[PDB]
Amino acid sequence: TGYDLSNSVFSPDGRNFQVEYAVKAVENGTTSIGIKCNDGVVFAVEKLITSKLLVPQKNVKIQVVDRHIGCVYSGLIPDGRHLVNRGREEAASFKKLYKTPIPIPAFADRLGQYVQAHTLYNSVRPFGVSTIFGGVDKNGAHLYMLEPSGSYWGYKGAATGKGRQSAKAELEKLVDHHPEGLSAREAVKQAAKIIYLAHEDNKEKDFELEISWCSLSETNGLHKFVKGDLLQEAIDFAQKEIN
Amino acid sequence: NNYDGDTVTFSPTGRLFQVEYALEAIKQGSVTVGLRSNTHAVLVALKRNADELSSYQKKIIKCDEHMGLSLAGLAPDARVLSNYLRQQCNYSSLVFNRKLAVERAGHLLCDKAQKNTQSYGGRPYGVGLLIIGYDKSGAHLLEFQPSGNVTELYGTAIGARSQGAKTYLERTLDTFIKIDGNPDELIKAGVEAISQSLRDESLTVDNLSIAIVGKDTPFTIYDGEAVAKYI
Amino acid sequence: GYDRHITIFSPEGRLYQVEYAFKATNQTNINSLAVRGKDCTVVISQKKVPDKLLDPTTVSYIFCISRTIGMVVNGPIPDARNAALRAKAEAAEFRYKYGYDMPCDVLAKRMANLSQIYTQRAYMRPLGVILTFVSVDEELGPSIYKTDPAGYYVGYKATATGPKQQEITTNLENHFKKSKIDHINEESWEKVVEFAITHMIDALGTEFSKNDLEVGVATKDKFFTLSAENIEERLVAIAEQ
Amino acid sequence: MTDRYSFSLTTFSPSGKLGQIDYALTAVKQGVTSLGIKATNGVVIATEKKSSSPLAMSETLSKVSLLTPDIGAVYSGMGPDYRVLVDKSRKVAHTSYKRIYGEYPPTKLLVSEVAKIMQEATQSGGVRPFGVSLLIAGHDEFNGFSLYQVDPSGSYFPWKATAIGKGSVAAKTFLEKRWNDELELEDAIHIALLTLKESVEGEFNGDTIELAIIGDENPDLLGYTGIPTDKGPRFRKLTSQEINDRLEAL
Amino acid sequence: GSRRYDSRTTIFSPEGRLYQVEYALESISHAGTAIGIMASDGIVLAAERKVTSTLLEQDTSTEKLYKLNDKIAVAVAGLTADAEILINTARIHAQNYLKTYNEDIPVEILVRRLSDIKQGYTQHGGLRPFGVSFIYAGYDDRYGYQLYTSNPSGNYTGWKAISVGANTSAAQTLLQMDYKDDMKVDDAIELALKTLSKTTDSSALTYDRLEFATIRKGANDGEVYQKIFKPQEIKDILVKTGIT
Amino acid sequence: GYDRALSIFSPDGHIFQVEYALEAVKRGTCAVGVKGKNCVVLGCERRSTLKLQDTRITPSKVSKIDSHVVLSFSGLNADSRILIEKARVEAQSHRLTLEDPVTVEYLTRYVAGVQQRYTQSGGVRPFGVSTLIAGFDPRDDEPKLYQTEPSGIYSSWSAQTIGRNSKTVREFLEKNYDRKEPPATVEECVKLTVRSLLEVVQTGAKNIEITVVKPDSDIVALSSEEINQYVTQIEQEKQE
Amino acid sequence: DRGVSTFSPEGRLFQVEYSLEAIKLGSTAIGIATKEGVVLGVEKRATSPLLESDSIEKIVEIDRHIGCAMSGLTADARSMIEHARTAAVTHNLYYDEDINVESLTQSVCDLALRFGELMSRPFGVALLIAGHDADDGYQLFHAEPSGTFYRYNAKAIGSGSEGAQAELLNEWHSSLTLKEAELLVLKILKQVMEEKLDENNAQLSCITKQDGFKIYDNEKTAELIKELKEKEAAE
Amino acid sequence: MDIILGIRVQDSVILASSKAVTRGISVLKDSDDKTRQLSPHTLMSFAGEAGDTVQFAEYIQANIQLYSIREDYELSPQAVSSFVRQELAKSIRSRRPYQVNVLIGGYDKKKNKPELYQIDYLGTKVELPYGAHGYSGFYTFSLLDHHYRPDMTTEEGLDLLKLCVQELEKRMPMDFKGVIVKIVDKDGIRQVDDF
Amino acid sequence: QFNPYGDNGGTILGIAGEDFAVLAGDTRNITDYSINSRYEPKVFDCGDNIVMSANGFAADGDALVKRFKNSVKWYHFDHNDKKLSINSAARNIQHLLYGKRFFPYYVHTII
Ligand SMILES: [Cl-]
């Protein structure tokens, strides 16, 4: 054997074991989710409070790309940052040449091709992150999830990390119970609940909630962080549901 | 085992062993402590010597008038990273006439360390850094790890037996955070914190190394007879 | 045995990495089919959306390479999209350099040559995909050309790809033995799509709803994919006969 | 990133063997039989069209390829490797000769250039040898008609007649009995078809056999008139019908 | 990364030998024998073709003996493809020298440069060496008639008579026995053929399995002529010495 | 470009590639250097398994780097040519910029530097060669003899030998060479050099090469008969 | 095989650790720093008696105010010295002043880790860099291939280093004169050396503010050796 | 730099080269040797742009000396002249060409014949019985056409050369401070100290 | 054609005493016959008790002062906070200026 020692090597199955090993690093990471709504998207993430010494609200994990796209990820945090840095370069060169801000499907492929490129050679390592991202463009709202292999699809809801299965189950219920659609302000509240429910799979250390959102009506199509009263309102909603 | 030959290889459980071995170099390094209030930020570092005839390895490096760090692990790697920080702080000043934010400083270090963990041939940095600074949003303390992970904290410690000082700061959190407009008392708290990581050896005049930055205080380092006050 | 890790010859004159790339082709567990009419070329593929959370509109293995050329892929989506982007760029550059739309068979050859390079050069791995290109060429008429990881390519009267490819292949073979011709003798593309779906149903032995299929159609001067309602309309016609 | 394979993947073993070349020759052995026969007034090259599927159109896949108007090529082994060699062989005929001398290269020199390309794949960094053996038939004014074989090593040999691939051992024996120095082109085509029937198993007709000649000039295939010195290509691919005519009087 | 698959072609063994060079020499030892004999009034180059087939075109063939310029020729032993790469380089080097100095290149200078190229492949670049041994036969106005040999190591030496390829041990003993310094070309022709005839692995030595060439001053007055023997000319010289 | 680090450290602190390059030197034919009061003599072994050689055209073992400096060697012959070429170029380059020929120490230092560079450069192996560099500095009558080796270290020697069975001939020179009184004349120096080679060589026929270098670019190579006279004289004195 | 810039499980670079083993095989070099100057001494260690020992150059001048002693694979030190000399002269050109001993050492140590897959391996040589400047006065540095340098009051490197270092621990005090330091280097060298110490197989040097860096003659060292033997017999 | 002459006679080549080095309105030196020995039996005189002349001459000298050491053999004057021409032929299409004109006087030991080559900065080579560069030729060529014979001795060549220098000293505008004369023959190169 | 230089006028003056030194300069900035600023300082404290002024083309003058100020900063980093002597600063400035020998800073510098 030895097929798993090098990246870009096909096993006799037709599999790239190095990419599958990168997925294990993603599964080890904290829970992050994405919820598509009526006129936008909502992102949320679990931040494990390792110590009292961590400054609250000052270790921001969700990242903005351009002014209209939000990105969140689970797994190796530095690898995620590298991917977002690339995303920003891709989005900048698109706007430079074509004037209009990069569409979300267009942006999704730019990351997809970049991550896929890191499965082509043995001189590079696959990305150790699954990235949930999306935003609002001319064609409306889009939510995507990108994996170490370079595989991505559009999603109604998306989840990844240690509590992905708990979050996926909770996401599936929302899709069933809301066929006509979910509102932006509702999706923020739901996002909080799902993170709190997904925290049951990581309950040794207590955690800190972080939410962001893009909405055509609520945020005027731009990416913003949920803070202050709207954040505390979402936390209280989540606290009430676990009890 | 079979997956630790280079940084480009993942283990079956999704681990990067070369990055973990680089992390191990920090644990062997001498203890250093970081802590801050709202007005000032302090670095305290236990320096290490080869023998009685040798000097004590300098742990603290200045990056700008408002920023600097302490190191633990491979000193040459700290020199490379601190030099990079000096250039980035300097680029921010020349081009934008703007003091570099301590948060951006961390982001830049994270991205520089990351590139070394995804490419063949290179190696991870073998050093941990505690960056302190005072910028437009007040005092700051960062912890850099060569995996790429940077974390903003009220207080922390890295190196050998750093758990003792880290526990102390976790207890003292409410006290030292409110030491505002009083440099000497914030240092005292940091010196008492690093003392919880000592075994058999005590803090002497050419052993202790302290640095401070704050509201009306540029980043300055204290060594020799200047730290005799705090023993 | 490092001769099985990179693209160099084994003692028996084989490239195991190329052979294993062929097995990656069936990783998605999707069967595709392509046939030619008089005026058109129709390609159909299974569409499997297992996760309920997925946006089904974004789940696709058919690509519009140029205005005239379409491409369906059998294999993992990252490699599929990799091939799709390259083919689009190649088709665009061809038009710019040579002043006319890149033919289907020329694009197939170009992508096949690229695939060949990966089988000879060590640092590049083969793509684990089989690319089926379709168009109505202005010189050669209705065209089906298929590429694989080995760098092999050839024109087809009709073709099928996937896990149950052989069952579909013989089903089509037996039809062309009977009809005595190289194509589907049919005027409208609508009925050629109906033929394609009907013969896939017979070969695979499964029934299809509107969301279980994905259809691409090539006519003169344009290639286009069908919506769910376009396919549903097509499924109704089959059931009513 | 970047191609880090700057070292040879083909190296000498203790016994003195170049493993990858030997293994490339093994791949050629597995390949379908092809042959070439040289006559007094022409050359014939032929091979079986092994179809991957009956749905596949075997006309689109050309095993016999024109390199120059007076030079043709056929192979045994890996088809994709052959295809890219033909592309490189056609281009090198222009870049390293026609663009310099204003005329097409003689057979031996074009063969030499192809051999050079195949040799480099044997020694250059991060590549395997080509998994094919070529048979190159051609004509030029000063050397007349000629037939060459080119191996994965980059070695080439001129032949009166030969065969490569699956049933080459038996085919070469058959050609030894039938070949003489007084053979006319039509006689060589007849012998080629006889030799090839032995190795072919399934259908044997103009649709499953690919055969081309290097013979007289073809003014009708030139595409224009007005220049007396330009008399047309000596390379001609025999049609499916033309083959079947000769299979009746077999 | 790619380190895993590197053969490391340019390294020493514990004994201080170059693995790849040694294995390349082992390869060459299975190649058809080539003999060079230097006489007072010329040089002979004789070489045995590798197991010939009856349908091989013999007259329009070149496997062993190659012309570098009007005054210098080489006999090859090993991979032919490798040899042709080196031959074209040698041909170009000779023309560079002529272009620069308006004088034909001295034999040793050409040999040294070609040997220096081989040396390079054993010390750096990570590539396999050229699996080729040459016998250089040439003339210049400094040293007159000269025979050299080079091998994959890039080491070259001068000779009065020398063999490369297969059965060199047996061949060198026979040459050492019958060679003498006041020898003529016609005598050297006979020695070359007799040596091959005894060391050959074939049943009997025939015209179709040989390549032959001479470098005489047999032209008209103080000038050198290269004669690459035709098939019929080899047939005649084989009968004339009483081998067939 | 080929980058591989071929020369690297081992757990015990050795660079095996450099040490294996020394084994190649140990395989090479013996070479000896002896410096007298007003001269230096370079002796060299030539193995006698090679008959039917052409000694006119065969590369000589001792090479002139400039008109006043010579270089002999032991080890891989092909490798030695590269060092000699580089040294010859540096010799002319020094004359061009400094307007003065190289000192023997400088030329040695350069060659040694080249050998060292190949011990910590990527993609290359060390030179399988040790050299003896001898000559006289410009406008100087003090004899110079230096030795280099694959690692890159170099040093000056009153007398030294390298190559196969060099430990035997070094043993001979260590008791026969007096520091307080070196060979006063050319004849004495050549004789001691020939004597030392006769401990190892076999026969004193066409196996020994001798090259004598004297001050002010006075270098000459001895012929067979001239060397044979020393061999004949030494053997007659030995039978005692 | 394995990467050149690889970490061990303990968190050390394999190649750097292996180069340190090569340095232990090297000949002994000792340095002692005083308020009157810095002394540097080395074991020459000739491999054979025919080798002219005066050509063994293991003590080296970098500038007038900075000297250098080496131990290990001494051939590797040539490019380090070349760099140091250039750095020292270049700084004088840019700033019209002598360069600090520490700054010079730092410049040399920057080369150390510039290896990988830059040069192919670390240096197999340790350096003792001694000098003087106006700011920090007389200084002695130990530059390793790890890229690390420590300042020392006294330091021994090479095969007899651990034995010599233990001896320097006891003998060194802050009021040592230059003459006392010279004898102390000779004393400790004679203890750890295999062959018997004399003027031909051992070499002394020093750096003073007044006269700069000077390598001692064999005549001068011989008298210090004779003075040393007499003083030990005197009690 | 200004006056360089060359005369090939029966058994030797004689090169004469002016001693003056002028910059502006000042004769900086009056004892300059405008020649370099390329090999024991080959001598090259030069004239042209300041700096370029010596830089080129020494560069050629180094290359020829390198060849001599490598092969332990002296290149023929014909071979050296061809090498020099090629270097100038490269130079003329460079970013900054060597503006140097040369005469190469040599004795071929294999042919036992003297040889004189005239090469200008463009790389224009000609073998001649007598040669000159610059304005010198406008006087000396017609003079030598008249007085030169092919079978002359070295002494006759020197008298013929004196006749040229006298004519130049009479009719040339600039003071070139006399000439350094050198002879190239079978015994090598030597300088005439009293001219 | 684009002319990369300009003249911003003004004048500067440096005098040295026994235990002190002055560096004066007017605060006027001009182009052609127009006044740009009545108060635009061009005499700067560069640290280590060194004052500097680069008068002429202001853009080049500002760039130079900016580079020297930065040179002082890095001198401290690289040489253990050593004070840059006036003579050392002068030599450093020579290299800054001569570094652009073939596209000069059009300024008259005084420290
Ligand atoms: Cl192509």
Side-chain angles (χ1 to χ4, degrees), chain C residues 90 106 109-114 117, chain D residues 83-84 87:
Chain C
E90 291 289 348
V106 179
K109 184 188 177 179
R110 172 55 180 168
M111 296 301 295
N113 283 352
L114 263 32
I117 290 164
Chain D
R83 194 178 58 250
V84 301
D87 292 326

Side-chain angles (χ1 to χ4, degrees), chain A residues 168-180:
Chain A
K168 274 201 185 79
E170 210 64 34
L171 253 39
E172 282 180 37
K173 283 150 187 168
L174 284 170
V175 174
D176 291 328
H177 294 144
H178 302 276
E180 24 60 48

Side-chain angles (χ1 to χ4, degrees), chain I residues 72-108:
Chain I
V72 171
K73 194 190 185 188
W74 279 98
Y75 186 81
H76 293 317
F77 287 148
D78 294 323
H79 304 87
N80 197 232
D81 281 322
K82 179 178 176 173
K83 196 200 185 185
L84 182 64
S85 49
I86 195 77
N87 68 286
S88 300
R91 178 67 71 78
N92 176 233
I93 291 171
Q94 171 171 78
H95 280 79
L96 292 175
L97 291 166
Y98 202 89
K100 275 172 65 64
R101 166 64 175 76
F102 302 113
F103 184 26
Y105 289 115
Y106 266 36
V107 294
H108 288 142

Side-chain angles (χ1 to χ4, degrees), chain G residues 65-83:
Chain G
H65 69 286
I66 294 168
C68 175
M70 67 193 75
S71 176
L73 296 172
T74 55
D76 291 11
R78 301 301 151 200
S79 65
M80 299 180 75
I81 297 299
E82 173 57 28
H83 178 93

Side-chain angles (χ1 to χ4, degrees), chain A residues 1-3 5-6 8-16 36 109 113 116 119-122 144 149-158 167-168 171-172 175-176, chain C residues 1-2 4-6 16-18 20-21 23-24 27 51-56 58-61 76-79 81-85 122-128:
Chain A
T1 54
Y3 294 100
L5 298 170
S6 188
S8 85
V9 173
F10 286 113
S11 68
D13 319 54
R15 288 154 62 194
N16 189 0
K36 190 184 180 180
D109 197 57
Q113 297 287 0
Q116 191 279 145
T119 68
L120 290 176
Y121 318 94
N122 52 206
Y144 283 92
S149 65
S151 175
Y152 70 84
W153 303 112
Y155 284 86
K156 291 163 179 169
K168 274 201 185 79
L171 253 39
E172 282 180 37
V175 174
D176 291 328
Chain C
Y2 288 131
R4 310 213 168 194
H5 292 215
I6 50 163
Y16 281 104
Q17 280 295 300
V18 177
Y20 301 160
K23 265 175 276 181
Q27 197 261 311
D51 199 337
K52 213 196 299 179
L53 301 176
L54 281 163
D55 182 6
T58 67
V59 181
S60 177
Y61 287 90
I77 195 69
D79 284 3
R81 283 162 178 165
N82 181 101
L85 176 58
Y123 85 109
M124 288 253 49
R125 74 166 170 87
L127 300 172

Side-chain angles (χ1 to χ4, degrees), chain F residues 9-39:
Chain F
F9 292 105
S10 289
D12 61 342
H14 291 140
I15 308 169
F16 283 139
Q17 275 294 115
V18 176
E19 280 169 23
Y20 298 164
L22 268 164
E23 296 295 330
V25 173
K26 272 198 275 279
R27 177 170 291 95
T29 59
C30 184
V32 60
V34 182
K35 86 194 207 182
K37 219 277 178 181
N38 46 220
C39 68

